[PDB]
Design a protein around this ligand. Structure first.
Ligand SMILES: [Cl-]
Length: 126
């Protein structure tokens, strides 16, 4: 008797100042080196986060494809999310590593953060 979801476990990649970014993963059925990550950004605060831009880097052996995001606004009070697809190419199947760069306005400040994603599960690259 085991209760874990079948497939690639989801993670909270970042959570700070009321911004929360979740990652869910889909391994391609046809291409063992391709992993599709859908990001959901949420805002648990009382003010909207505007002009949201999610960017990311991977190591040189990898390749990245960022598709366009559903929106620029992370609504206040958790009334919606921003969705963005990113595809990761890992031809050598090495340990997945990602640095994210976030940029947005909130509470009358231009917000910046740069942070490493530390909790990729082994099934997102193995
Ligand atoms: Cl987590």
């Amino acid at each position: 008797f085991n209760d874990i979801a079948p497939g690639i476990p989801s993670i909270t990649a970042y959570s700070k100042n009321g911004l929360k970014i979740e990652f869910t993963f889909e391994r391609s059925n046809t291409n063992p080196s391709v992993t599709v990550i859908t990001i959901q950004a949420s805002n648990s605060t009382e003010l909207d986060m505007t002009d949201f831009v999610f960017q990311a880097d991977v190591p040189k052996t990898f390749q990245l494809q960022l598709l366009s995001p559903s929106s620029s606004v992370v609504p206040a009070f958790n009334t919606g999310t921003i969705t963005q697809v990113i595809k990761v190419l890992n031809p050598q199947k090495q340990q997945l590593r990602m640095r994210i760069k976030l940029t947005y306005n909130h509470k009358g400040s231009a917000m910046q953060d740069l942070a490493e994603v530390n909790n990729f599960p082994p099934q997102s690259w193995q």
